[PDB]
Every structure is written in C-alpha cells, then in structure tokens.
Structure 1
Amino acid sequence: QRCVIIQKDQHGFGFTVSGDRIVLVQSVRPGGAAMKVKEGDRIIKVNGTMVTNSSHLEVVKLIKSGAYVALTLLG
C-alpha cells in the first residue's frame, strides 16, 4: 500500500482505470505524469474517501472531481 500524488498534464492525468467492484489500474501513458505508478495497481483509497465499496462511476467521479488527485494504491 503506497501513497502517490499526480497533477494533470497537457495530455490529461496519464493513466487508465478499470474494474467495477475492485477498481484498479490497466495502462499508464509511457510519457504521462504517472510513468515518469506501476502497471497493475489496485486503488484502495481516493481523495480521502476509501474506494473499497465504490462503483467504477464513483471512483472515476472522485478522481475527476478535482484539479489534482492524490491516491493510495496497493502493489
């Protein structure tokens, strides 16, 4: 379990969320703001609210409802 913070860029955040009950990470843009986050990381906390019981729409909303997002993964 790790805590990482990333700011938006000229090409968005720089990662892709997948899953429903267990929301996690699929690909990271090789030149985004996440590559320079690992491929295959489960998001367990987002923006203060734990996304253990969150829907995909809820996680996406949480990450997107703000300028910068700060989250807690599990690798």
Structure 2
Amino acid sequence: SIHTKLRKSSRGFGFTVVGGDEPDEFLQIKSLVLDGPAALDGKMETGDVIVSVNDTCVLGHTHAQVVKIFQSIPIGASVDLELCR
C-alpha cells in the first residue's frame, strides 16, 4: 500500500493510466511524466495499481470513469491516491 497526494496542474497530474477496459479489470499507472507532479513527488511508480482516488474505491471502474474523475479535478485542487504494488 502506497498513499500520496498530488496537486492538479494545467498540464495534468503527470502520469498515464492503462487498464479498466471492462468493469472487471483494475487500472495501472503506465508512465510518469518528466518534471510532472507525480514524478517530483516520487512515490508512484510504473505498474502500480490504482486502488482509490479521494477516498473513492476505483477497483471496478472503467478506464473511462477514472479518467473522468481525474479530469474533473480543478487546477490547484489536490487528489489523494492509494496505490498497490
């Protein structure tokens, strides 16, 4: 279990996700963006499974729902992430 908190920038949170192509498959961090919030923070790493976002469990959500909740965060607001590796 890994817990972090990232601030939303105009360029995003600084990471890419994969998975969630059907409601039964979990999501994963595919890449970290150079000089992005995820990377300066240094706690997330490629292959990490996304468990929850702002206390909301995302294991069971589609890749589309999760992208939506990440893009739904206003610039400057922060997000609490729980990841498993």
TM-based fold match above 0.5: yes
Q: For this structure pair, what is the TM-score category when the shorter chain's length is used for normalisation? A: 0.7 to 0.9
With normalisation by structure 2, the TM-score equals 0.77
**Aligned residue-pair number:** 75
Equivalent residue number for residue 16 of structure 1:
16
- Report how far residue 8 of structure 1 moved: 2.1
- Rounded to whole Å, the distance in 1 between the matches of 2:39 and 2:73 is 21
Equivalent residue number for residue 69 of structure 1:
79
- Higher CA-based Rg: 2
With normalisation by structure 1, the TM-score equals 0.85
- The structure where helix makes up a greater share of residues is 2
Measured on the aligned residues, the alpha-carbon RMSD in Å equals 1.4
Segments of 4+ in structure 1 off by > 6 A? none
SS in 2 for 1:58: helix
Matched, 1:35 2:35: no
Q: Which runs of 5+ in 2 are unaligned?
A: none
Q: Which runs of 5+ in 1 are unaligned?
A: none
